[PDB]
Enzyme design. Structure first.
Site, PDB file in Angstrom:
ATOM      1  N   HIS A  16     -14.027  -0.799   2.755  1.00  0.00           N
ATOM      2  CA  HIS A  16     -12.880  -0.705   3.643  1.00  0.00           C
ATOM      3  C   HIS A  16     -12.090   0.542   3.263  1.00  0.00           C
ATOM      4  O   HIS A  16     -12.398   1.234   2.287  1.00  0.00           O
ATOM      5  CB  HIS A  16     -12.030  -1.967   3.545  1.00  0.00           C
ATOM      6  CG  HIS A  16     -11.432  -2.167   2.195  1.00  0.00           C
ATOM      7  ND1 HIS A  16     -12.052  -2.878   1.196  1.00  0.00           N
ATOM      8  CD2 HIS A  16     -10.263  -1.726   1.679  1.00  0.00           C
ATOM      9  CE1 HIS A  16     -11.290  -2.853   0.110  1.00  0.00           C
ATOM     10  NE2 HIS A  16     -10.194  -2.173   0.386  1.00  0.00           N
ATOM     11  N   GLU A  30      -4.475   5.199  -2.042  1.00  0.00           N
ATOM     12  CA  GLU A  30      -3.874   4.274  -2.998  1.00  0.00           C
ATOM     13  C   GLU A  30      -3.743   4.916  -4.368  1.00  0.00           C
ATOM     14  O   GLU A  30      -2.649   5.031  -4.910  1.00  0.00           O
ATOM     15  CB  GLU A  30      -4.677   2.967  -3.031  1.00  0.00           C
ATOM     16  CG  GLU A  30      -4.464   2.208  -1.741  1.00  0.00           C
ATOM     17  CD  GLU A  30      -4.653   0.724  -1.827  1.00  0.00           C
ATOM     18  OE1 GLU A  30      -5.690   0.311  -2.372  1.00  0.00           O
ATOM     19  OE2 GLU A  30      -3.818  -0.032  -1.291  1.00  0.00           O
ATOM     20  N   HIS A  77     -12.854   2.266  -0.333  1.00  0.00           N
ATOM     21  CA  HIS A  77     -13.194   1.361  -1.421  1.00  0.00           C
ATOM     22  C   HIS A  77     -14.501   0.668  -1.089  1.00  0.00           C
ATOM     23  O   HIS A  77     -14.575  -0.098  -0.129  1.00  0.00           O
ATOM     24  CB  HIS A  77     -12.091   0.316  -1.595  1.00  0.00           C
ATOM     25  CG  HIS A  77     -10.833   0.880  -2.156  1.00  0.00           C
ATOM     26  ND1 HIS A  77      -9.627   0.219  -2.141  1.00  0.00           N
ATOM     27  CD2 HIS A  77     -10.605   2.083  -2.726  1.00  0.00           C
ATOM     28  CE1 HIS A  77      -8.706   1.014  -2.662  1.00  0.00           C
ATOM     29  NE2 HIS A  77      -9.280   2.129  -3.059  1.00  0.00           N
ATOM     30  N   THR A  92      -6.135  -4.390  -4.932  1.00  0.00           N
ATOM     31  CA  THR A  92      -4.898  -3.753  -4.486  1.00  0.00           C
ATOM     32  C   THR A  92      -4.222  -4.495  -3.350  1.00  0.00           C
ATOM     33  O   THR A  92      -3.174  -4.039  -2.873  1.00  0.00           O
ATOM     34  CB  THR A  92      -5.127  -2.299  -4.111  1.00  0.00           C
ATOM     35  OG1 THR A  92      -5.901  -2.241  -2.910  1.00  0.00           O
ATOM     36  CG2 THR A  92      -5.780  -1.493  -5.234  1.00  0.00           C
ATOM     37  N   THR A  93      -4.759  -5.641  -2.958  1.00  0.00           N
ATOM     38  CA  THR A  93      -4.101  -6.572  -2.062  1.00  0.00           C
ATOM     39  C   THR A  93      -4.062  -7.942  -2.716  1.00  0.00           C
ATOM     40  O   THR A  93      -4.909  -8.266  -3.563  1.00  0.00           O
ATOM     41  CB  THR A  93      -4.878  -6.673  -0.745  1.00  0.00           C
ATOM     42  OG1 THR A  93      -6.251  -6.960  -1.020  1.00  0.00           O
ATOM     43  CG2 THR A  93      -4.815  -5.364   0.050  1.00  0.00           C
TER      44      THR A  93
HETATM   45 ZN   LIG Z   1      -8.908  -1.357  -0.970  1.00  0.00          ZN
END
Ligand SMILES: [Zn+2]
Length: 265
Positions: A93, A105, A118, A197-198
Protein backbone atom coordinates in the site's frame (compact mmCIF):
# COMPACT_ATOMS: atom_id res chain seq x y z
CA UNK A 1 -16.23 0.42 15.30
CA UNK A 2 -12.99 2.23 14.44
CA UNK A 3 -12.92 5.92 15.24
CA UNK A 4 -9.40 6.49 13.96
CA UNK A 5 -8.38 8.28 10.80
CA UNK A 6 -6.24 11.19 9.61
CA UNK A 7 -8.55 14.12 10.39
CA UNK A 8 -8.19 16.73 13.10
CA UNK A 9 -10.75 14.95 15.29
CA UNK A 10 -9.47 11.40 14.90
CA UNK A 11 -5.91 11.63 13.59
CA UNK A 12 -2.53 10.52 14.85
CA UNK A 13 -2.52 12.71 17.97
CA UNK A 14 -5.71 10.94 19.12
CA UNK A 15 -4.69 7.35 18.40
CA UNK A 16 -3.11 6.71 21.83
CA UNK A 17 -6.52 6.80 23.52
CA UNK A 18 -7.67 3.56 21.87
CA UNK A 19 -4.11 2.28 21.23
CA UNK A 20 -1.81 3.30 24.10
CA UNK A 21 1.15 1.64 22.37
CA UNK A 22 1.09 4.77 20.18
CA UNK A 23 3.39 6.22 22.89
CA UNK A 24 5.57 3.10 22.93
CA UNK A 25 9.31 2.63 22.72
CA UNK A 26 9.48 1.37 19.10
CA UNK A 27 6.97 3.39 17.10
CA UNK A 28 7.13 4.14 13.39
CA UNK A 29 7.72 5.99 11.17
CA UNK A 30 10.92 7.77 12.21
CA UNK A 31 13.20 10.40 10.81
CA UNK A 32 16.39 8.79 9.45
CA UNK A 33 19.33 10.96 10.59
CA UNK A 34 21.89 9.69 8.11
CA UNK A 35 24.85 10.76 10.23
CA UNK A 36 23.77 8.70 13.25
CA UNK A 37 22.39 5.77 11.23
CA UNK A 38 25.74 4.05 11.14
CA UNK A 39 27.08 1.67 8.53
CA UNK A 40 26.98 -1.93 9.78
CA UNK A 41 29.21 -4.27 7.74
CA UNK A 42 27.61 -7.32 9.32
CA UNK A 43 24.38 -6.53 7.41
CA UNK A 44 23.94 -8.93 4.50
CA UNK A 45 22.45 -7.95 1.12
CA UNK A 46 18.70 -8.06 0.87
CA UNK A 47 17.12 -10.85 -1.19
CA UNK A 48 13.85 -9.66 -2.75
CA UNK A 49 12.45 -12.58 -4.78
CA UNK A 50 9.25 -11.42 -6.46
CA UNK A 51 9.49 -13.29 -9.79
CA UNK A 52 6.59 -15.61 -8.85
CA UNK A 53 4.46 -13.06 -7.02
CA UNK A 54 0.76 -13.71 -7.47
CA UNK A 55 -1.39 -10.59 -7.03
CA UNK A 56 -5.08 -11.12 -6.34
CA UNK A 57 -7.05 -7.97 -5.64
CA UNK A 58 -6.90 -4.22 -5.06
CA UNK A 59 -8.92 -2.73 -2.22
CA UNK A 60 -9.80 0.69 -0.84
CA UNK A 61 -9.91 0.06 2.92
CA UNK A 62 -10.85 3.63 3.95
CA UNK A 63 -7.32 4.76 4.75
CA UNK A 64 -5.21 3.63 1.75
CA UNK A 65 -5.46 1.15 -1.10
CA UNK A 66 -3.92 -2.30 -0.72
CA UNK A 67 -2.78 -4.67 -3.45
CA UNK A 68 -3.16 -8.17 -1.96
CA UNK A 69 -1.07 -11.23 -2.81
CA UNK A 70 -1.42 -14.99 -2.45
CA UNK A 71 0.74 -15.69 0.60
CA UNK A 72 0.03 -19.42 0.84
CA UNK A 73 3.47 -20.37 -0.49
CA UNK A 74 7.03 -19.03 -0.49
CA UNK A 75 6.58 -17.37 -3.88
CA UNK A 76 7.17 -13.67 -3.27
CA UNK A 77 9.56 -13.55 -0.32
CA UNK A 78 11.96 -11.20 1.40
CA UNK A 79 15.00 -12.62 3.15
CA UNK A 80 18.54 -11.64 4.00
CA UNK A 81 19.54 -8.25 5.23
CA UNK A 82 18.76 -8.08 8.95
CA UNK A 83 16.22 -10.89 8.68
CA UNK A 84 16.32 -14.36 10.18
CA UNK A 85 14.27 -16.66 7.95
CA UNK A 86 11.74 -16.12 5.20
CA UNK A 87 9.06 -13.45 5.00
CA UNK A 88 6.12 -13.79 2.59
CA UNK A 89 4.65 -10.80 0.76
CA UNK A 90 0.99 -10.33 1.74
CA UNK A 91 0.17 -6.84 0.46
CA UNK A 92 1.50 -3.45 -0.48
CA UNK A 93 0.00 0.00 0.00
CA UNK A 94 0.96 3.69 -0.19
CA UNK A 95 0.93 6.87 1.85
CA UNK A 96 0.70 10.21 0.10
CA UNK A 97 0.03 13.91 0.57
CA UNK A 98 -2.39 16.62 -0.48
CA UNK A 99 0.47 18.11 -2.54
CA UNK A 100 3.82 16.90 -3.88
CA UNK A 101 5.79 18.40 -0.97
CA UNK A 102 4.67 15.82 1.60
CA UNK A 103 3.22 12.35 1.83
CA UNK A 104 5.96 10.01 2.99
CA UNK A 105 5.98 8.51 6.47
CA UNK A 106 9.68 8.13 6.95
CA UNK A 107 11.85 11.18 6.39
CA UNK A 108 15.55 11.39 5.52
CA UNK A 109 17.34 14.18 7.41
CA UNK A 110 13.84 15.74 7.78
CA UNK A 111 13.14 15.60 4.03
CA UNK A 112 9.69 14.37 2.97
CA UNK A 113 8.86 12.67 -0.30
CA UNK A 114 5.58 12.89 -2.20
CA UNK A 115 4.63 9.31 -1.29
CA UNK A 116 5.90 6.11 0.28
CA UNK A 117 5.30 2.47 -0.70
CA UNK A 118 5.10 -0.26 1.97
CA UNK A 119 5.51 -3.89 0.92
CA UNK A 120 4.36 -5.93 3.92
CA UNK A 121 5.76 -9.39 4.60
CA UNK A 122 5.24 -11.88 7.44
CA UNK A 123 7.59 -14.44 8.98
CA UNK A 124 6.74 -17.97 7.81
CA UNK A 125 7.69 -19.47 11.15
CA UNK A 126 4.37 -18.08 12.50
CA UNK A 127 1.97 -19.70 10.05
CA UNK A 128 -0.15 -16.67 9.10
CA UNK A 129 -0.20 -12.87 9.21
CA UNK A 130 -2.51 -12.70 12.22
CA UNK A 131 -0.15 -14.83 14.29
CA UNK A 132 2.93 -12.95 13.01
CA UNK A 133 1.69 -9.49 14.05
CA UNK A 134 1.69 -10.70 17.67
CA UNK A 135 5.47 -11.17 17.64
CA UNK A 136 8.43 -8.70 17.61
CA UNK A 137 10.02 -10.51 14.64
CA UNK A 138 6.69 -11.11 12.89
CA UNK A 139 6.75 -8.63 10.02
CA UNK A 140 9.24 -7.14 7.63
CA UNK A 141 8.15 -4.01 5.77
CA UNK A 142 10.10 -2.78 2.80
CA UNK A 143 9.63 1.00 2.55
CA UNK A 144 10.30 2.73 -0.76
CA UNK A 145 10.09 6.47 -1.34
CA UNK A 146 8.34 7.95 -4.37
CA UNK A 147 10.02 11.04 -5.81
CA UNK A 148 8.19 13.23 -8.33
CA UNK A 149 9.77 13.11 -11.78
CA UNK A 150 9.34 10.91 -14.84
CA UNK A 151 6.30 8.65 -15.05
CA UNK A 152 6.90 5.19 -13.64
CA UNK A 153 5.74 2.38 -15.97
CA UNK A 154 5.76 -0.07 -13.07
CA UNK A 155 3.10 2.00 -11.31
CA UNK A 156 0.81 2.57 -14.27
CA UNK A 157 -1.19 -0.67 -13.97
CA UNK A 158 -2.06 0.32 -10.40
CA UNK A 159 -3.02 3.90 -11.25
CA UNK A 160 -5.16 2.70 -14.17
CA UNK A 161 -7.43 0.63 -11.88
CA UNK A 162 -7.92 3.19 -9.10
CA UNK A 163 -11.06 4.59 -10.70
CA UNK A 164 -12.73 1.24 -9.90
CA UNK A 165 -12.09 1.51 -6.13
CA UNK A 166 -12.81 5.17 -5.48
CA UNK A 167 -14.64 4.68 -2.16
CA UNK A 168 -14.08 2.77 1.05
CA UNK A 169 -14.88 -0.92 0.79
CA UNK A 170 -14.63 -1.16 -3.00
CA UNK A 171 -12.31 -3.81 -4.43
CA UNK A 172 -11.42 -5.19 -7.86
CA UNK A 173 -9.69 -8.24 -9.29
CA UNK A 174 -6.04 -7.39 -9.85
CA UNK A 175 -4.04 -10.33 -11.17
CA UNK A 176 -0.62 -10.53 -12.85
CA UNK A 177 0.77 -7.36 -11.28
CA UNK A 178 4.55 -7.67 -11.01
CA UNK A 179 5.92 -5.83 -7.95
CA UNK A 180 9.45 -6.05 -9.39
CA UNK A 181 8.41 -2.94 -11.28
CA UNK A 182 8.27 -0.99 -8.02
CA UNK A 183 11.90 -1.65 -6.97
CA UNK A 184 14.69 0.89 -7.51
CA UNK A 185 18.05 -0.12 -9.00
CA UNK A 186 19.87 -0.21 -5.64
CA UNK A 187 18.85 -2.34 -2.69
CA UNK A 188 20.95 -0.32 -0.26
CA UNK A 189 18.89 0.24 2.87
CA UNK A 190 18.45 1.46 6.41
CA UNK A 191 16.90 -0.85 9.01
CA UNK A 192 15.48 -0.45 12.50
CA UNK A 193 12.91 -2.16 14.78
CA UNK A 194 9.51 -0.49 14.79
CA UNK A 195 5.79 -0.70 14.41
CA UNK A 196 2.82 -0.66 12.13
CA UNK A 197 2.16 2.97 11.21
CA UNK A 198 -1.61 2.62 11.60
CA UNK A 199 -3.67 1.25 14.46
CA UNK A 200 -3.18 -1.18 16.08
CA UNK A 201 0.42 0.19 15.96
CA UNK A 202 1.91 -3.11 17.07
CA UNK A 203 5.68 -3.20 17.56
CA UNK A 204 6.20 -6.22 15.32
CA UNK A 205 8.07 -4.77 12.32
CA UNK A 206 11.63 -4.99 11.09
CA UNK A 207 11.71 -1.86 8.90
CA UNK A 208 13.85 -1.93 5.80
CA UNK A 209 13.79 1.47 4.07
CA UNK A 210 15.51 1.72 0.71
CA UNK A 211 17.97 4.54 0.10
CA UNK A 212 17.00 5.05 -3.55
CA UNK A 213 13.52 6.41 -4.35
CA UNK A 214 11.50 5.29 -7.31
CA UNK A 215 10.05 7.90 -9.64
CA UNK A 216 6.42 8.90 -9.97
CA UNK A 217 4.95 11.50 -12.28
CA UNK A 218 2.90 14.35 -10.81
CA UNK A 219 -0.03 13.02 -12.82
CA UNK A 220 0.37 9.57 -11.26
CA UNK A 221 0.35 10.80 -7.69
CA UNK A 222 -2.62 13.07 -8.51
CA UNK A 223 -4.59 9.92 -9.26
CA UNK A 224 -3.92 8.64 -5.72
CA UNK A 225 -5.65 11.83 -4.50
CA UNK A 226 -8.85 11.03 -6.42
CA UNK A 227 -9.56 8.18 -4.02
CA UNK A 228 -11.88 8.91 -1.10
CA UNK A 229 -11.79 8.05 2.60
CA UNK A 230 -15.59 7.81 2.63
CA UNK A 231 -17.89 5.00 1.57
CA UNK A 232 -20.40 5.17 -1.28
CA UNK A 233 -23.40 7.32 -0.23
CA UNK A 234 -21.52 9.56 2.19
CA UNK A 235 -20.21 13.11 1.73
CA UNK A 236 -16.96 12.94 -0.20
CA UNK A 237 -13.70 13.20 1.76
CA UNK A 238 -10.62 13.04 -0.51
CA UNK A 239 -8.05 10.45 0.52
CA UNK A 240 -4.97 12.63 1.03
CA UNK A 241 -2.40 13.11 3.79
CA UNK A 242 -2.82 9.51 4.99
CA UNK A 243 0.62 9.52 6.65
CA UNK A 244 1.56 9.36 10.31
CA UNK A 245 4.18 11.94 11.45
CA UNK A 246 7.57 10.69 12.55
CA UNK A 247 7.80 9.34 16.08
CA UNK A 248 10.57 9.45 18.72
CA UNK A 249 13.48 7.14 17.98
CA UNK A 250 14.05 6.69 21.74
CA UNK A 251 16.77 4.07 22.40
CA UNK A 252 16.81 2.50 18.95
CA UNK A 253 19.65 2.34 16.46
CA UNK A 254 19.08 2.71 12.73
CA UNK A 255 21.69 0.72 10.80
CA UNK A 256 22.79 1.43 7.23
CA UNK A 257 23.76 -1.36 4.83
CA UNK A 258 26.01 1.10 2.97
CA UNK A 259 28.38 3.99 3.62
CA UNK A 260 26.44 7.25 3.44
CA UNK A 261 28.07 10.48 2.34
CA UNK A 262 27.72 11.71 5.94
CA UNK A 263 29.97 8.89 7.21
CA UNK A 264 33.69 9.59 7.23
CA UNK A 265 33.94 5.81 7.61
ZN1 LIG B 1 2.04 1.82 5.48
Amino acid sequence: AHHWGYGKHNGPEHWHKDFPIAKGERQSPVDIDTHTAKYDPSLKPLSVSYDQATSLRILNNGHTFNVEFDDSQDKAVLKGGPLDGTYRLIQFHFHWGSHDGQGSEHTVDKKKYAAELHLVHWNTKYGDFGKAVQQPDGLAVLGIFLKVGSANPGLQKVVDVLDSIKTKGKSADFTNFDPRGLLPESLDYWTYPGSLTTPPLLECVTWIVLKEPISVSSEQVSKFRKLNFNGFGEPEEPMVDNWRPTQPLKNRQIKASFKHHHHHH
